[PDB]
Design a protein around this ligand. Structure first.
Ligand code: NA
Ligand SMILES: [Zn+2]
Length: 138
């Protein structure tokens, strides 16, 4: 259900770190992946799993979270609420939250839900996990 991703060397391919020893994460960056939806039924699991699987217990030097939305087909009002809080709360404790591969329909659903404001902007969105890493690295 929830996974942390790492890079296959010399590629643009990201796989589960706990299923492929060959992949390596980037220092200070955690890449978190969920499934088809972020909506009312699983937004609580998502935030919980995001805190746990990443280990940002304010106990490590993780400065950036990348959310892999490639699998996400559907978002609803609660899902959007939750995601927005995730971003603002991680921001408050020094963690940049960026989103990879958010499809046009999801972006559209997010905008209808007034997800984007001066704080949460579309500049947090990237075409790929790759582009996101580059950005989070500065
Ligand atoms: Na793989
Ligand atoms: Zn970033």
């Amino acid at each position: 259900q929830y996974r942390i991703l790492g890079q296959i060397p010399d590629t643009d391919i990201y796989c589960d770190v706990e299923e492929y020893e060959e992949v390596k994460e980037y220092p200070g960056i955690k890449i978190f992946q969920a499934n088809t939806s972020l909506y009312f039924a699983n937004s609580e699991s998502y935030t919980s799993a995001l805190k746990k699987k990443t280990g940002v217990d304010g106990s490590t030097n993780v400065h950036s979270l990348i959310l892999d939305f490639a699998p996400v087909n559907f978002v609803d009002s609660v899902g959007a609420k939750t995601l927005k809080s995730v971003i603002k709360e991680y921001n408050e404790v020094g963690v940049c939250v960026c989103i990879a591969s958010c499809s046009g329909p999801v972006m559209n659903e997010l905008t209808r839900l007034n997800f984007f404001d001066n704080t949460v902007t579309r500049e947090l969105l990237f075409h790929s996990i790759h582009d996101a890493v580059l950005a989070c690295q500065g």
